[PDB]
A paper describes a structure:
Glycerol kinase (EC 2.7.1.30) catalyzes the transfer of phosphate moiety from ATP to glycerol to form glycerol 3-phosphate (G3P).
Subsequently, by replacing the cryoprotectant solution with 20–25% glycerol, we were able to solve the enzyme-substrate complex with a clear electron density that could be attributed to the bound glycerol moiety. In total, three different crystal structures were obtained in the presence of glycerol, constituting 13 polypeptide chains. The substrate is bound in an evolutionarily conserved cleft within the N-terminal domain that opens towards the C-terminal domain. The glycerol molecule is coordinated by polar interactions with side chains of Glu149, Arg 148, Asp317, Gln318, and additionally with Arg148 main-chain amide. The carbon chain of glycerol packs against hydrophobic Trp168 and Phe342. Of note, we solved and refined five CtGK structures, and each of them belongs to a different space group, despite crystals having grown in the same buffer condition. We observed that in the absence of nucleotide, CtGK adopts open conformation, which upon nucleotide binding closes up.
Numbering used by the authors:
A (entry chain A): 65 to 540, 550 to 583
B (entry chain D): 65 to 540, 551 to 583
């Protein structure tokens, strides 16, 4: 038949997958690449490590695709999904990087954020772009680069400086960056919504936003904002095993995950578990500015006359990191599987609640003076109770964020899909269904984020006619966990958690 | 030479030691005996298991003593020290136990305690006897026995019921219970101060106290209250390897530990480490009734015209039990040695504070709605930080109790002596000195509690002439000195008290 490829360029690993018409992979290749931490809190990557990682996964996956009897001519199109915010700067003329890419967790911008928050109009940014000032957005990373690296400052003033998120860099280079007929310098609405340069409501660059950061549109090269699904805006792969294959899809990774879960209606949510959590909440065609510190962002922009769809986003710092803490810091067990086994070994949390505020707590609590705080310990408390409480902590915080999304949105939570990391813990996802009072859907096909980009590319090139056809086609280990806990009991457990959170604030003094 | 024996009858162990004139043991024998836990919170012992364990230690220790070339004729007298409060009832005529002994931690009295506190006149008890109503004192255990066992009620109403703490039971039987010329049913001032039957200031049974519990002086046989050191009041061992050897000393175990530490001056304190802590604070010859829930009790009553000495007492639930918690519950390590090593692995607590209120917190905090609460956890927190915080928790609570004792008594803390259990941890002891700002004295000779009874018996029979002779004779690592800047110690204590305050209100029912 006909297949769709997906480049999934992540924070620590790259991937290329080839999906069939029902969204199941037939060929895959993964590579872990090098992350650089020059100074403390600094996080960098060689942009060519990102591109070459990807090119190696293309070569590997296509080597098997061939063993299956297929070639690039069997690939209708490829989509791209990427770690968001990570900032790349390159020379418009050479097409070469002027500095390393600054990865989204990088904290070098700390001081620069404090100054920008003091500036006039800082209060207006949230309503314009959907995000508040912080170290994460590409805006502060790009401005920091220009202010602290003389190559990129020089480049900026000479008019040769090009900016891009990872999607733009990959698409730019894959088309044969600079030395190419019709060079492709673009970014999709989801990725562009993460810079703080784009008006969330118009999906176009906003001069009041760019003006605040001091970036002149006439002097830097910004990627053209295009839909997440387009038959031509992204061009094609120039050389290699995919030479001549069109790129037709592009989505920020967390948005791509929502698409991979078919979260297309208002109130449909996804949670992706890793070290922490990234939750996205489909809010429909009108953006929602949060009153609870949630981010307003684009879910997907599939064009074809259809309105762009927005989302509310929240994140949790400690999910898998809590299991890691139990395994390494406390030595409970040497494998995460065995941590779950300990949690399953006991019937309940034993009264234990673990407010996993290692670095304080964020949305909807925003408690900066709590640390990790463990309540309910008695002589009868064993490793299993603490393991359970650690899994429960992520479920409570997930509910707290979803509860805020409901209030922000006005849309009742209609469904929750989970992928990655701790979602593999049957106990944890069963606990999530119990606590939130909603079924929890876990796809057996695990590459949800990669599939989102394939869906985007497939829609642009008639692999799928519409979004209803995507759902029906994708829907053709346990997969759905249904609430089994007495509601009165779920509410008591959630109130005990919220009690513990409140009792945790004010620990830290300065 | 002349030696002094000491019977040390404990909650889980019995032992007999023979001390020389310098307070060092030359023969020892220890036996672990059976404790019975019928239901949850119930704790019982066969009174003959205590006596037989003890008698077996006497025989064993005297076999080693003989190999040294000595016999009973070389032992001027023996002393007895015992687990307190543990309540024994036996038949006045036969001398046999009517029920098993109810050990001090037994909580079957909880409902009966609730009723007695609701009663009128309950507010008067503390100032009379020095203790408030709780599950621990023998009074509630005896009253429970009378109300729920018909062998005792009948024995009680028939006029045959004899009551005793473990000291009284042991001395009664060792002299030959019932069928003995001159039978001895006695108890010392320290043990008698623990029942709630005795006026603390007069050292005699109080009709208002006994009346409150409904115990009739003329119907039950109570032990005669005598000094902790007396040449005749305790009689002598009737049979066995010590037949004819006088009993001349008797002290509740925690008082005996203070004596064994030579804590004879006001402001001298001791802490004995086990599963928890028992701290005693010498307050001199006039008792101090606490305003912070500390117990007022008799330190020792050495008679010979001397006036009895009183103490303030406090206890901590989690000391050694905290190490056990790290080892077994959390699997940090398999041996206390290694838990200590982990705590030594780090330079400080890492910001971690462990309010070890597994069963709430007692004096001076009295927080009944807290549980164990661990603060300060980050991704940089390791087993060593938590192990350190666990040792620190006992030091912080030790200081809080000592601080309350100073305020109650008005006597400045002069010294702190430690024995048993966690006192072997140099780090814990050094941290205690750092936090309390006072030297911590740990005797190299380990049987501090047994020595106290030997001192009592030795004083009564001129092995030692005076307390100055006791001190000098025994004095013939050991001290931990504060090495932490007071500024840092006060910050650490303030973080602990912050954590304690942040812990209250956890339990909602």
């Amino acid at each position: 038949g006909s297949f769709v490829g997906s480049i999934d360029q992540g924070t620590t690993s790259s991937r290329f997958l080839i999906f069939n018409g029902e969204g199941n992979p037939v060929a895959s290749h993964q590579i872990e690449f090098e992350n650089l931490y020059p100074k403390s809190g600094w996080h960098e990557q060689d942009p060519y490590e990102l591109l070459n990682s990807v090119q190696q996964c293309i070569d590997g996956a296509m080597h098997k695709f061939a063993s299956l009897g297929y070639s690039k001519e069997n690939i209708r199109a490829i989509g791209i999904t990427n770690q968001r915010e990570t900032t790349v700067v390159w020379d418009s003329v050479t097409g070469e990087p002027l500095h390393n890419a600054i990865v989204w967790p990088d904290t070098r911008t700390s001081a620069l954020v404090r100054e920008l928050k003091a500036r006039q109009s800082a209060d207006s940014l949230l309503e314009l772009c959907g995000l508040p000032l912080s170290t994460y957005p590409s805006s502060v990373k790009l401005l920091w680069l220009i202010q602290n690296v003389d190559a990129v400052k020089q480049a900026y003033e000479e008019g040769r400086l090009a900016f891009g998120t990872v999607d733009s860099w990959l698409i730019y280079k894959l088309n044969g960056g600079a030395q190419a007929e019709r060079p492709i310098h673009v970014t999709d609405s989801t990725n562009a919504s993460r810079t703080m340069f784009m008006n969330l409501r118009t999906l176009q660059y906003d001069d009041k936003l760019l003006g605040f950061f001091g970036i002149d549109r006439n002097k830097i090269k910004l990627p053209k904002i295009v839909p997440s699904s387009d038959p031509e805006a992204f061009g094609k792969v120039a050389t290699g095993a995919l030479a001549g294959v069109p790129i037709a899809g592009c989505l920020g990774d967390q948005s791509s995950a929502l698409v991979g879960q078919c979260g297309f209606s208002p109130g449909q949510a996804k949670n992706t578990y890793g070290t922490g959590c990234f939750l996205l909440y489909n809010v429909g065609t009108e953006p929602v500015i949060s009153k609870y510190g949630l981010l307003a962002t684009v879910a997907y922009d599939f064009g074809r006359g259809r309105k762009p769809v927005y989302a509310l986003e929240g994140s949790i710092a400690v999910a898998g990191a809590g299991i890691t803490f139990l395994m390494n810091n406390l030595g409970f067990a040497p494998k995460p599987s065995e941590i779950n086994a300990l949690a399953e070994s006991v019937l309940d949390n034993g009264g234990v609640v673990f407010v996993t505020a290692f670095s304080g707590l964020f949305a909807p609590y925003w408690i900066d003076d709590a640390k990790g705080t463990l309540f309910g310990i008695t002589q009868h408390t064993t490793k299993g109770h603490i393991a359970r409480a650690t899994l429960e902590a992520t479920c409570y915080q997930t509910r707290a964020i979803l509860d805020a999304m409901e209030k922000d949105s006005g849309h009742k939570l209609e469904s929750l899909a989970v992928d990655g990391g701790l979602s593999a813990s049957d106990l944890c996802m069963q606990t999530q269904a119990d606590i939130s009072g909603i079924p929890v859907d876990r796809p057996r096909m695990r590459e949800t984020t990669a599939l989102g980009a394939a869906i985007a590319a497939g829609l642009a090139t008639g692999v799928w006619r519409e979004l209803d056809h995507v759902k029906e086609s994708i829907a053709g280990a346990r997969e759905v966990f249904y609430p089994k806990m007495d509601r009165k009991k779920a509410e008591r457990l959630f109130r005990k958690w919220e009690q513990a959170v409140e009792m945790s604030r004010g620990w830290v003094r300065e």
